[PDB]
mmCIF file of C-alpha atoms in Angstrom:
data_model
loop_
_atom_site.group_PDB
_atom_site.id
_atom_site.type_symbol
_atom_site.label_atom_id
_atom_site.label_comp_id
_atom_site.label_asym_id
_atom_site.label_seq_id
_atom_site.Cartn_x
_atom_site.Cartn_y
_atom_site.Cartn_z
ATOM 1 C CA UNK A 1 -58.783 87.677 85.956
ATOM 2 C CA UNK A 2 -60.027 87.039 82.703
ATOM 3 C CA UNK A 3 -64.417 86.899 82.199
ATOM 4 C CA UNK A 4 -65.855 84.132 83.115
ATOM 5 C CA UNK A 5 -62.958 82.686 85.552
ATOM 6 C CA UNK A 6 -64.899 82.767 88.839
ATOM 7 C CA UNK A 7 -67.383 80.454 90.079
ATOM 8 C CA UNK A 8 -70.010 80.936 92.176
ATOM 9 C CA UNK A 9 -70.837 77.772 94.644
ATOM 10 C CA UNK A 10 -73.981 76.969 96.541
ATOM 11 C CA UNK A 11 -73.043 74.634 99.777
ATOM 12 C CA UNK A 12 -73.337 73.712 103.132
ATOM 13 C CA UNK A 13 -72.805 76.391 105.491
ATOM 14 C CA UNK A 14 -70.441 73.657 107.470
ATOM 15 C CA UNK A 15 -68.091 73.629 104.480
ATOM 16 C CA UNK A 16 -65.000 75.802 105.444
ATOM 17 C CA UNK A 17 -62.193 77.255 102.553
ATOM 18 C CA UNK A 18 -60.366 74.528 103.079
ATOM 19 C CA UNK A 19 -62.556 71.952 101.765
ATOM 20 C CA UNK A 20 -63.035 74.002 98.652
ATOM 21 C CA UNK A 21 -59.360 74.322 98.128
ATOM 22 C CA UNK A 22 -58.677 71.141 98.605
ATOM 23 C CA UNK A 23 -61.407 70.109 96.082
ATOM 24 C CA UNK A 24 -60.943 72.802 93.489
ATOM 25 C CA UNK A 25 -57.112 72.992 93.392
ATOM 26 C CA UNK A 26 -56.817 70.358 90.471
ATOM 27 C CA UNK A 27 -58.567 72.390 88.169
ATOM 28 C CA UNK A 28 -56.224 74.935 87.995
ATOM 29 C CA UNK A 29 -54.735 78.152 89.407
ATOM 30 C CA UNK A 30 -56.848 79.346 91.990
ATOM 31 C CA UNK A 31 -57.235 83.239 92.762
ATOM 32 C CA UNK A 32 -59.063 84.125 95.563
ATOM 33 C CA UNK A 33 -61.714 81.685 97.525
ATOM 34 C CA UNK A 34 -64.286 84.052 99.570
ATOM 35 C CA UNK A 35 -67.236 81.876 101.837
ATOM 36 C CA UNK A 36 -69.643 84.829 101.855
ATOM 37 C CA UNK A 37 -70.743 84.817 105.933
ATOM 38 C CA UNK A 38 -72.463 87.876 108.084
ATOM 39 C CA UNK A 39 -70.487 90.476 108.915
ATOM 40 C CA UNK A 40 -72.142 90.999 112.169
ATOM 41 C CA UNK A 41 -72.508 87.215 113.577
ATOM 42 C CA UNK A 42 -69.289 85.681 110.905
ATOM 43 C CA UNK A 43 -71.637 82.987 110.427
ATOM 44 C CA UNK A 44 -71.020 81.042 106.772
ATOM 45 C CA UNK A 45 -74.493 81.884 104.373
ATOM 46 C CA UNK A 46 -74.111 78.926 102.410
ATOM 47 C CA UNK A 47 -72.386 80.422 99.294
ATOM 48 C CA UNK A 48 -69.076 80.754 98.216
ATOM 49 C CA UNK A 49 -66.894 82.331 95.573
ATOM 50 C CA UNK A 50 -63.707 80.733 94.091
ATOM 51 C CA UNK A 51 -61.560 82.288 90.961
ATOM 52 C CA UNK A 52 -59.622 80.690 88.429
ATOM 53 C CA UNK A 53 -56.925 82.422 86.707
ATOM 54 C CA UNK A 54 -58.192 81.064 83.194
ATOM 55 C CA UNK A 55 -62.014 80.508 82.258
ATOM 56 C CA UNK A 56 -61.502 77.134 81.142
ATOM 57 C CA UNK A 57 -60.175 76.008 84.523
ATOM 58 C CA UNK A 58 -63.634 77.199 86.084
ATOM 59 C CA UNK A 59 -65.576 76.220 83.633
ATOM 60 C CA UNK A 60 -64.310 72.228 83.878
ATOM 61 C CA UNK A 61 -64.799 72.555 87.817
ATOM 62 C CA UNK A 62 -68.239 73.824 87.073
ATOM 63 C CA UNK A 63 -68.518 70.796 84.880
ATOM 64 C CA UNK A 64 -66.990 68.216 87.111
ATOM 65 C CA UNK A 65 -68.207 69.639 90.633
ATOM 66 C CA UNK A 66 -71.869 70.116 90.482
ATOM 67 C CA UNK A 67 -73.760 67.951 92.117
ATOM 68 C CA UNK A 68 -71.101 66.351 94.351
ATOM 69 C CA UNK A 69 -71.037 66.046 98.273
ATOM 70 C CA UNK A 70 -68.065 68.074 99.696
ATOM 71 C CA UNK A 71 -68.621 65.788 102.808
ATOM 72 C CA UNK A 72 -70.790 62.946 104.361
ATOM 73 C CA UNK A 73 -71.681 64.923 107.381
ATOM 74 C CA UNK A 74 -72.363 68.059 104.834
ATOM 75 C CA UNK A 75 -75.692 66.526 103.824
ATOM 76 C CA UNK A 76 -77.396 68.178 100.340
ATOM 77 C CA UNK A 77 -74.925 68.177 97.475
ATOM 78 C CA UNK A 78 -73.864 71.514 95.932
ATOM 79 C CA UNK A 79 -74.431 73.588 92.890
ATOM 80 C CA UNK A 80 -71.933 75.205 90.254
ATOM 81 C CA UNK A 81 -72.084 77.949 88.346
ATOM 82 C CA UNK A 82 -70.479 80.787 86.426
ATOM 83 C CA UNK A 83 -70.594 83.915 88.404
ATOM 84 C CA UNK A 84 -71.135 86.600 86.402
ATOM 85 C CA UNK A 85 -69.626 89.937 86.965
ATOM 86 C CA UNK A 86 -72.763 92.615 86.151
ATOM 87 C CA UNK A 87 -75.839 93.172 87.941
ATOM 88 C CA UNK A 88 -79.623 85.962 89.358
ATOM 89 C CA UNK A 89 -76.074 84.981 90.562
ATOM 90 C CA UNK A 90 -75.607 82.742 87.549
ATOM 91 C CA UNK A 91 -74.239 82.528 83.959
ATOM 92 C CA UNK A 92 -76.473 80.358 81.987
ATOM 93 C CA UNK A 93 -74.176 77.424 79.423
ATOM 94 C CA UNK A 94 -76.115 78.504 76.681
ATOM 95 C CA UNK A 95 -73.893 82.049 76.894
ATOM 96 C CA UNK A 96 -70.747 80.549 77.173
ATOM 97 C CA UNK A 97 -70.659 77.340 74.319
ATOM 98 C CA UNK A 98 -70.500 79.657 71.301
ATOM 99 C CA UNK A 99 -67.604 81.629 69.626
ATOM 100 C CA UNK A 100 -67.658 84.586 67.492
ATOM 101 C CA UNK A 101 -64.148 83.999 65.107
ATOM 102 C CA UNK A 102 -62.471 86.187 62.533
ATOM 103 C CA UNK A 103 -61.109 83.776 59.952
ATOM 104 C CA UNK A 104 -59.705 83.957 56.034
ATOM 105 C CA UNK A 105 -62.080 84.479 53.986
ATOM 106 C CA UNK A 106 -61.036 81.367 52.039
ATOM 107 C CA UNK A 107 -61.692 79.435 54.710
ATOM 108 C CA UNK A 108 -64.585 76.758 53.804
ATOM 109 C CA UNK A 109 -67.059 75.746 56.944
ATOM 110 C CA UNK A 110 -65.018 72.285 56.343
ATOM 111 C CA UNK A 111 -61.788 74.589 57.336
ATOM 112 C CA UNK A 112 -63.452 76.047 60.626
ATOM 113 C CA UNK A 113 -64.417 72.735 61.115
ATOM 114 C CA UNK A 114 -61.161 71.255 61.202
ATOM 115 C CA UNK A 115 -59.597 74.189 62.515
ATOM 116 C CA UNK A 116 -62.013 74.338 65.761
ATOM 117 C CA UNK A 117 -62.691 70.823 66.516
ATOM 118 C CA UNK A 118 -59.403 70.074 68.673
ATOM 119 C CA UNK A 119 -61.095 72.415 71.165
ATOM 120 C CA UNK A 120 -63.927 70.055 71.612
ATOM 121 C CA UNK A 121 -67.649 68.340 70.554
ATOM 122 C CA UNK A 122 -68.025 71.371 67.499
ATOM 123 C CA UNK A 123 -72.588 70.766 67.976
ATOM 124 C CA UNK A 124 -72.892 73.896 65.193
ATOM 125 C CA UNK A 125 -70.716 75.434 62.954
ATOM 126 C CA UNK A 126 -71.061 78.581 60.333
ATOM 127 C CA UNK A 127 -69.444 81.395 58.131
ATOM 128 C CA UNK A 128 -71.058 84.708 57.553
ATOM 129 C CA UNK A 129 -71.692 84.903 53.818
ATOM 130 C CA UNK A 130 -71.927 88.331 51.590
ATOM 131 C CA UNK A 131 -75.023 87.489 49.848
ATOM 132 C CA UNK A 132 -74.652 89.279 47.280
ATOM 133 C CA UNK A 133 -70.865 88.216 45.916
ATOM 134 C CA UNK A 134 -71.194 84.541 47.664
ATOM 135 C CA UNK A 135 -68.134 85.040 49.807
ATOM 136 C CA UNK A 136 -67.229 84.626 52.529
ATOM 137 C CA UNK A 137 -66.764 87.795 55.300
ATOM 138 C CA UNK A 138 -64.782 86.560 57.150
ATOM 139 C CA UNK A 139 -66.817 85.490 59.922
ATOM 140 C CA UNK A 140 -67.329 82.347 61.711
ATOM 141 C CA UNK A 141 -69.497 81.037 64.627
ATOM 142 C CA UNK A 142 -68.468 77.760 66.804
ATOM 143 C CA UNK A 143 -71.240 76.566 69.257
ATOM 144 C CA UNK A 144 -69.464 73.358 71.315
ATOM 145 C CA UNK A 145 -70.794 71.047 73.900
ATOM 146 C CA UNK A 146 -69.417 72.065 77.223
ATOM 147 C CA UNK A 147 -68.902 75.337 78.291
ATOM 148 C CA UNK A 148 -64.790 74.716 78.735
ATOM 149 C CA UNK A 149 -64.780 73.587 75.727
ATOM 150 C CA UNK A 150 -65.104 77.272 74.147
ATOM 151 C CA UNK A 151 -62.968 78.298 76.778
ATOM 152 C CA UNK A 152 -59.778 76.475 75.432
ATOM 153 C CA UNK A 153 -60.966 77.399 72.042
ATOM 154 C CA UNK A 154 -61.097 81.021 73.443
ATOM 155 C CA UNK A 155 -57.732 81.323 75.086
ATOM 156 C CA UNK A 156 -55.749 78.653 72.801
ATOM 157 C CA UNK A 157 -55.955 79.471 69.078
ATOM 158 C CA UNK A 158 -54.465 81.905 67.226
ATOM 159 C CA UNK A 159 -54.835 85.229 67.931
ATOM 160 C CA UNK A 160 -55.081 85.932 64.390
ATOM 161 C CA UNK A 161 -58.556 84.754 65.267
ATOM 162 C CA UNK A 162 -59.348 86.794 67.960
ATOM 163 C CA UNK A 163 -61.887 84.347 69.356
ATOM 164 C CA UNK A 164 -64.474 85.584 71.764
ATOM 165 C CA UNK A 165 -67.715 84.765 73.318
ATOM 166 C CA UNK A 166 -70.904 85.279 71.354
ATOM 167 C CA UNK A 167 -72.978 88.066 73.177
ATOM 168 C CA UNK A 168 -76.284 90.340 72.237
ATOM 169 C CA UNK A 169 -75.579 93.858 70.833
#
């Protein structure tokens, strides 16, 4: 259950678990789908919950699902997101499309470059310099277009790298 790896799904309160597994099954290993419903009347409230076992499968169903119809009698299409795990409901992409990256410190940006952009779109791309001496510290940030982008970064390279999300101290 790695971060990021469950989705959280707004939808009709007609759609039952089997329509989501049905639609979400191609995007990878799912975990666990729960159709939140009152535990009094067991009456569907509309949202749902459905993990991944890696972040980039959620991420491209995320991507790929939101906005679509899960059925022509279910009316209003639904909406994707991230769930995230700490006390709205919702990730926003502008958390999850940049990487924090520990690289050689002779690594060039050109180098990070062409080291990151098999992942995906690379839309900004930098190395933490030491002022003072010029070098480099060994740092590196990686901001991509799509959310699952990152994620493959994230959970493909190297560990060597020890790639992570970029998150506020």
């Amino acid at each position: 259950m790695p971060p990021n790896s469950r989705i959280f799904l707004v939808i009709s309160k007609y759609t039952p678990e089997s329509v989501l597994r049905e639609r979400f099954s191609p995007f990878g290993d799912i975990q666990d789908i729960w159709v939140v419903r009152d535990k009094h009347t067991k009456e569907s409230k509309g949202i749902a919950f459905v993990k991944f076992a890696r972040s980039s499968q959620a991420c491209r169903a995320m991507e790929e699902m939101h906005g679509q119809c899960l059925g022509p009698n279910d009316t209003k299409p639904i909406k994707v997101f991230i769930a995230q795990s700490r006390s709205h409901r919702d990730v926003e992409d502008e958390e999850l499309t940049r990487i924090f990256v520990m690289i050689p410190k002779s690594y060039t940006e050109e180098d990070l470059r062409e080291k990151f952009k098999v992942y995906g779109d690379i839309e900004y791309c930098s190395i933490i310099k030491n002022k003072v001496t010029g070098e480099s510290k060994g740092l590196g940030y990686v901001r991509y277009l799509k959310p699952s982008q990152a994620a493959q970064a994230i959970e493909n390279c190297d560990r060597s790298f020890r790639a992570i999300l970029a998150e506020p101290k």
